[PDB]
Amino acid sequence: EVHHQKLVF
Amino acid sequence: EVHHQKLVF
Amino acid sequence: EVHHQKLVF
Amino acid sequence: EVHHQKLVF
Amino acid sequence: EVHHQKLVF
Amino acid sequence: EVHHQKLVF
Amino acid sequence: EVHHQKLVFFAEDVGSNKGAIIGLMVGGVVIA
Amino acid sequence: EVHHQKLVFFAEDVGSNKGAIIGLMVGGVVIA
Amino acid sequence: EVHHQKLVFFAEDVGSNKGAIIGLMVGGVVIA
Amino acid sequence: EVHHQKLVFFAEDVGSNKGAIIGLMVGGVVIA
Amino acid sequence: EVHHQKLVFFAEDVGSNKGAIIGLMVGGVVIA
Amino acid sequence: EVHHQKLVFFAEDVGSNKGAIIGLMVGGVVIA
C-alpha cells in the first residue's frame, strides 16, 4: 500500500 | 507500505 | 515501511 | 420615602 | 429617606 | 437619611 | 437619584461546579 | 445621588469548585 | 454623593477549590 | 491496523479571536 | 499497529487573541 | 506498534495574546 500527496502554489 | 508528502510555495 | 516529507518556500 | 424588608425561617 | 432590613433564622 | 441592618441566627 | 436594596440568600451549593469536569479553550492551538 | 444596601448570605459551598477537574487554555500552543 | 452598605456572610467553603485539579495556560508553548 | 495522513494548511487568522470581546461564566455567582 | 503523518502549516496569527478583551469566571463569587 | 511524524510550521504570532486584556477567576472570593 503506497500513498502520498502534494501542495504547490 | 510507503508514504510521503511535500509542500512548496 | 518507509515514509518522509519535505517543505520548501 | 421609607422602605425595608425582613426574612425569618 | 429611611430604609433597613433584617435576617433571622 | 438613616439606614441600618441586622443578622441573627 | 437611584436607590437599591437586596436581601440575596443562597442555601446550598448554588452556582457551584462540584465534581464537574470542565475544559475550556479560548484561542490557542493544540496539535494532538 | 446613588444609594445601595446588600445583605448577601451564602450557606454552603456556593460557587465552589470542590473536587472539579478544570483545564483552561487562553492562547498558547501545545504540540502533543 | 454615593452611599454603600454590605453585610456579606459566607458559612462554608464558598468559592473554594478544595480537592480540585486545576491546569491553566495563558500563552506559552509546550512541545510535549 | 490504522493509517492516517494530513496536510492541513491555514493561511490567514483562521479560528482567531482578533479584536473580539469575550465574556464567559461557567458556574460561580455574581451579585452585581 | 497505528501510523500517523502530519504537515501542519499555519501562516498568519491563526488561533490568536490579538487585541481581544477576554473575561473568564469558572466558579468563585463576586459581590460587586 | 505506534509511529508518528510531524512537520509543524507556524509563521506569525499564532496562538498569541498580543495586546489582549485577560482576566481569569477560578474560584476565590472578591468583595468589591
Swiss-Prot record, chains A, B, C, D, E, F:
Q: Which residues does this entry assign to the site Cleavage? A: 6-7
Localization per Swiss-Prot or TrEMBL: Cell surface
Tell me the residue numbers annotated for binding Cu(2+) 2: 3-4
Binding positions for Zn(2+) 2 per the UniProt entry: 3-4
Describe the subunit structure.
Interacts with S100A9.
Protein name per the record: Amyloid-beta protein 40
- The species this protein was found in: Homo sapiens
Residue span relative to the full protein: 682 to 690 of 770
